[PDB]
Amino acid sequence: ELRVGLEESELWLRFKELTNEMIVTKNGRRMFPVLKVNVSGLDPNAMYSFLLDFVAADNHRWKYVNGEWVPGGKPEPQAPSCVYIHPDSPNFGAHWMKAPVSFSKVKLTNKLNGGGQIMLNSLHKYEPRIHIVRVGGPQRMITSHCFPETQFIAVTAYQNEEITALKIKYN
Ligand SMILES: O=C(c1ccco1)N1CCN(C(=O)C2CC2)CC1
Q: Where in the cell is it found?
């Protein structure tokens, strides 16, 4: 059985208990904390690509009002984010299981851009999600995993200074 776990969940949970925020810029900003995934139960000899996307956790716009995040009253349907291919992809199961799969080079943007960067909507709440795609083999297979612990609101600047402080303390 394929097992997927979050590395450094301890630290993600500190961010989550304050409501996590991730900066988006026109050129695109790397994530802190970085999503790192523990994977076991792959076929060491089979070929796989690791994909990352962001699910809109709800259909609302959020605003930091008097020291607290509060949703708008006018939901709109969100639509899927684009997919980021882990740059090690494609690769052997052995490669992926030898150390945590680290998405350190994904950049989050607010503007439709050349390539690589993933465009999110500012002030929407997102749940990171990976897909492990068995490729090259006869039977293509996908396994998906969500990381509730890694939820964040996309922001053009930090609103909760408690988040600013945690980001600096641990980077
Ligand atoms: O690992 C995969 C893959 C397998 C299944 C879905 O994607 N690929 C896709 C295409 N590739 C590219 O062209 C580079 C990105 C520009 C990178 C390798």
A: Nucleus
CB distance 90 to ligand 1 below 6 Å = yes
Residue 135 Cβ contacting ligand 1 at under 6 Å? yes
Distances (CA, A) of 43 to 22, 46, 96, 100: 34, 5, 10, 16
User: What method did the depositors use to determine the structure?
Assistant: X-ray
Q: In the chain, how many domains are there? A: 1
Resolution, given in Å to one decimal, reads 1.8
Domain of residue 159, CATH code: 2.60.40.820
Burial 85-117 (b: 16+ CB within 10 A, else e): ebeebebebebbbeebbebeebbbbbeeeeeeb
Range(s) of the domain holding residue 116 = 1-171
d(CA 66, CA 70): 10
